[PDB]
Symmetry: none
Subunit: 307 residues, 6 copies
């Protein structure tokens, strides 16, 4: 709370108004008296804060420290000019100071609004999520019945494609008797259908891999890995092989094939992957991943790879 309350204030002090805006996904400050908000409609909206003390080097830098200190980190204009932390409510914050930013009077701050809502899968249908698909009714059945059976599916796309929004909805299809264990860095997933579950969160000295490793020791029926980003991918790979009921996850890729390539790469980055050939890894995944849903830049499915 002590490392907290002070942050809560600075936060509201600078981005109080913005964080209250609806249908937003990103608030950026480019150390230039302008706050930019990215709305789900995908349009960026600029705001002049010139006449605001809250956005003064001191007030800003205060907020900066309040963020670093909150996650037991530090930010300076020397060895630690770049910082990744979170706001009191979890929202991820990216802060950059000189000399990485252009100059002496420039401070960069970026915040991702984890879109808190949960649509019903049905909603996706009503909206024509699978309308680009030539097998609209096939996929739809595939998703519902596959996930229910316990297949390994992956949802991917670019930043702001709704990947997460989607996997949250398709969770309905998971037997409610299932013990789910999720692994996120920011509480986004919601358990509207299952009662037996446990949420795991990484960050700081705790890596996603740590969570994964502990997940395996908590006897879960389903594992949902919010997103793949680096070394964890390798671990994810082992999990797939260790004959586990079913798995759900997301990652940034531009297609079924890219996702594979991208997985192999993330996996290689891990130590224990020093002796594994590349085609080894790729083929490994291609072998275990049951389906991959890719979402285009218009929150629409443009790819439903199976088998």
């Amino acid at each position: 709370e002590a490392a907290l309350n002070p942050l809560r204030h600075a936060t509201e002090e600078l981005f109080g108004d913005f964080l209250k805006m609806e249908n937003i996904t990103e608030i950026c400050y480019n150390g230039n008296k302008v706050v930019w908000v990215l709305k789900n409609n995908g349009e960026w909206q600029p705001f002049d804060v010139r006449d605001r003390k809250a956005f003064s080097l001191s007030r800003l830098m205060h907020f900066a420290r309040c963020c670093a200190s909150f996650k037991k980190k530090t930010i300076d204009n020397y060895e630690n000019p770049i910082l990744s932390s979170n706001l009191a409510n979890g929202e991820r914050v990216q802060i950059v100071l000189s000399p990485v930013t252009v100059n002496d009077e420039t401070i960069s701050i970026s915040i991702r609004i984890p879109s808190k809502t949960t649509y019903p899968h049905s909603f996706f249908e009503e909206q024509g999520f699978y309308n680009l698909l030539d097998n609209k009714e096939q996929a739809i059945s595939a998703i519902k019945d596959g996930i229910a059976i316990g297949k390994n599916v992956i949802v991917c796309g670019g930043t702001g494609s709704g990947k997460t929004t989607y996997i949250k909805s398709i969770m309905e299809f998971i037997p409610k008797e299932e013990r789910i264990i999720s692994i996120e860095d920011t509480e986004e997933i919601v358990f509207k259908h299952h009662k037996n579950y446990t949420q795991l969160f990484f960050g700081g000295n705790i890596t996603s891999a740590d969570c994964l490793k502990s997940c395996l020791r908590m006897r879960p029926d389903r594992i949902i890995l919010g997103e793949l980003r680096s070394s964890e991918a390798y671990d994810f790979y082992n999990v797939l092989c260790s004959g586990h009921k079913g798995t759900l996850t997301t990652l940034h890729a531009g297609s079924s094939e890219e996702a594979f390539i991208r997985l192999a790469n993330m996996s290689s980055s891990n130590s224990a992957a020093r002796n594994i050939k590349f085609e080894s890894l790729i083929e490994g995944f291609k072998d275990l991943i049951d389906m991959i849903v890719h979402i285009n830049h218009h929150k629409q499915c443009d790819e439903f790879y199976i088998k």
Copy 2:
């Protein structure tokens, strides 16, 4: 510890039919029975109730604990415990139950297991958590010549010796790693080696033993198929340092060459694959 242990989990470490105890730092204790289902318990009216820690109770049973910032919040802690099975079904039970029914060579495999094991063949049983892996290998232990000198290596006494007199149990944990026990094991003149479960580095050591021309070995691991077992074995093997110059295809193939059979059990405690070597 015995006190804190029996304080928090005194009424659960008794229960009925169980294998896992789990506290999600949310006023509720979940226990996994061998039937396969979870049982939830409300412990709201209980005062009894380096952020990641892997330990054991005072009785050996493994303890998995995680504190925040790893768990969700500041008022959330994560705890799990590895509740074993302590009942040695006679292999015939497995047959009576239809353990081999899914197999299209039901009677062939069943003879394979019994004769293979007696012969001293390298077998492996695998599946998902709570598939009865350990329950199974325990019962197939009869088929080992009673004159055999058995050496097991487990972190939690689960295996039982109902048919052998000449044996020694080895347990790891803490500063002592499975690999340690395995290396000692090799120095104890065994006839049969039972490695309760492969999980990490040891896999490499196991590999070498396989190669060191030994009588026969038994073990389990988590995989979803004969093929996955192999892949899985190679990965675990690589994690060890001494495996820095060994190529991947090298490892897998090495295993594919030394393992004689592999029994995979599905989520229904039923065999859906019985693999036999052909290379």
Copy 3:
């Protein structure tokens, strides 16, 4: 506020200005006149009383500095240390005879001493004047930048429509071919609504057409890859990577794969094909590329890069790779 932003900065600035004086002075002492000349791109000294200036017209102009104390072993050596000490480095005639640093304003400086240089009284210095003059694209057309091309008007439309659509283009060539000046110009064609994030070690790019952007700079313990990693966490719509040089290339590779809007960058190559080869080699140098086959990488790039503009030694495009 400035009252504060001043007060806030006040001490710090002073301390910075202090540390730089030694250099700022040595710098102007020796290359004052030279650094002032217009349309230059390189100032070189070969430890022989003559200073060489390379003008954008591509011609080298020699200058006799025989009658100049500034160019004396001691004075020169002084400047040499001022540069090393400026980037917390050291330069000697032993374990550290070769030095890569920068001048007070960012320009990169290369200094070599004996025994790497020919002899005892020979000091080598080379300075790179950075792209400090923006040019709207029209200029390039007027000058016949696409004249050597057999599809002059085709490429031109490709660059304009391709960059606007969000394609991955790369501008390459030799050192001093106008790579950076060119890409800067083609930035107009990016939708002004886009949020751009650049990464360079010296502020050359200029944002004449966009208002929502952030500039990232590396050097010291902060590597380009660090900025790249952070860039990703800043929600950009476009990423302009000044120039690919080593490991970052791998990271760049992944970004291309991670389905990002579009990307701009420059590297040194002699052709579309050389660029590819070159990328793969730079990528392999990264640890996390230890399991990726060569032809894997190359083919990886060949598949993601949309177009490649190569510029010859006469600031003219002699190759425009598409598809």
Copy 4:
């Protein structure tokens, strides 16, 4: 001599004798039995003896003080202290040492053993009875072979020429016993140098030789390196186990007369694999590819003799 070996023969006995007693105290009778190869105690009032015939013989020592936690534990320390080691129920629960006469002893205490009153001890009684190779023939060692008379000629003539042979098999397959007998075929003029950690090899046919032994701070690798500097004609490396392998590999390429040795493997092919893997464990093998190593060996080893679970040859490989 005496006045010169009295300061050492004094120390060595005021730490050895204690053990000699404890040893005979618990395993006196057992260590006296003939044709045995292993004595095991599983902390359960029963002593198990493994006879060469391969059968285990159990012995009730329930009514024996010698086998009491204190008496046993005493024996345990006598063993650790003998090789300047320590054994406890903490950081050092597992112990590998030797008896006064050399036999290797393996001891394990709680918490590695099952419980508080459980102490594990295993003694590898080294073999030691040389048959003239002919005995091996009379017994049908080469009977499972389809080229019985070919191999026999190969071993005899090959070893005499100075070929690189390896005899492998499981623990207690007679590996050593066999290589000792095939030593006949090595010209008696040859200068032989052996390297074992326990004197098993016997020189019945050669006079010019030197026995090297390792253990403690001295590794097989050290003996090997010294061996190379003692101008040998034949080298006999009792058994390969870990890094030495790599060193063994260099020797084979360092061109010299011939080499004999043994290792645990289940076949000609397993031998090779095995060799490569052991070689890798050596630092200096950090830049050598795996296939590199394997192929190197396959290139230098002239023949490999594998012995099955029944002390019979079931494989006779030969540069092909």
Copy 5:
């Protein structure tokens, strides 16, 4: 400190250092001084009746050389010494116990080149006579090197590789900024003014000079000779769209050059993921011409992409 040396130097090797067309002066601690003339013949000289060559006088010179480069030379931890004469020439001195005995001192001086044979000479000598396209190659070399093409000259040790690339340097536009990388000053700049020589050895590798070279804005790169890892870096340079490159290596043919290049490249760490056929093909594609010289200082092959 310098002066002292200048005296000792002239005292012992005064006459020798004055001889023309020499490249090496060696003393083997045995009253004989040996001079290596460019014609390649060794000329021995009896200095028996010379006090300059007495253990003390010699040893004096030895220290004067060590002390000159702030080094030390003794018959203990520092018996081997590498230093230079006042004028720069490199001196190699060795004392007991490295030398055979107590009264033996070894000294070797390397004289840098400074003469360039005009290309014309080569022609007059029939350097291209064995070639079936004598006049074509000749035009190729002159016009190619002027346009900026990657050429390699190869042959056996002592085939005049270096001597030949030096001569072909004329054809390089005089306005070019050249940068060479040798470990021994052989190349001479008769035709260019804007240039800079880089030398390796010791903790500084050729690859280091190459890397610095690339940050010095050269127009032309002259790499004295390819031998090991640098080969890989060299490869990168070629792909990095560089105006033109000149270099030499030991090979017995256009084809061997290539193989040889690929192998020297593989020896570099960063070449761990590059296939072999990958490398060779890479080169075959970048190199424009290869000139092979036979054991009789004559061109027996003139490959042209």
Copy 6:
């Protein structure tokens, strides 16, 4: 610090060290001294009635050997010792607990090459008799070495490797500047006047001599023997396009030499990035001929190309 040794040495092995045509003297801590004659036969000698061979007298000699090379030998951390006698000959000493027991001391001493037989002698003795191309090789050796090819002579300890290379030195043009590197003066220069001998040992390693060697402008380099890291250095030299090189190492075949060369090369730090096949292939490439001598001082292999 030398005189005490000279005494113990002559004390125990005085007579033995005097015998002619021997190559090894071994003592197996058993009152018997064994001598290996060049004819390859071992000759045993009973020294039971000799105090020189008493644990104390022996142990004394042992220490004199350790102390001579600033080393130590005991029956604890230093039971194994590699040193040399006053004249250079290498001595190997082993004490309990490495030797079989308390009263066992092992000692072995190599009799370096001293006598030089001219090449003709080797022919008269049928050195190339086991060769199917007796007259081809002989011509190969003579014309190759004269041309300046990289040859290697290998075999077992005491196979005459050194004696042989010494004899084949005739064929090197007498105008050549030869530079050898040994740790014991064995090589002789009966045909060349311009040469310098380099010797290593102590703080000076062969690699050091090798590095200086390269700065002494030699025409030919004779590397007494390859044994560990220098091998890498040797490799570079091979690559650095040098006139010709002669050397010996213990291998059992042409192929073994190669493998053996790559392993030794790997032991050097700078070879941390070079793949194994990279090195081997590097050698295979450069080495022109390898002469292997069997345990009967006879050539049983004459690899070429």
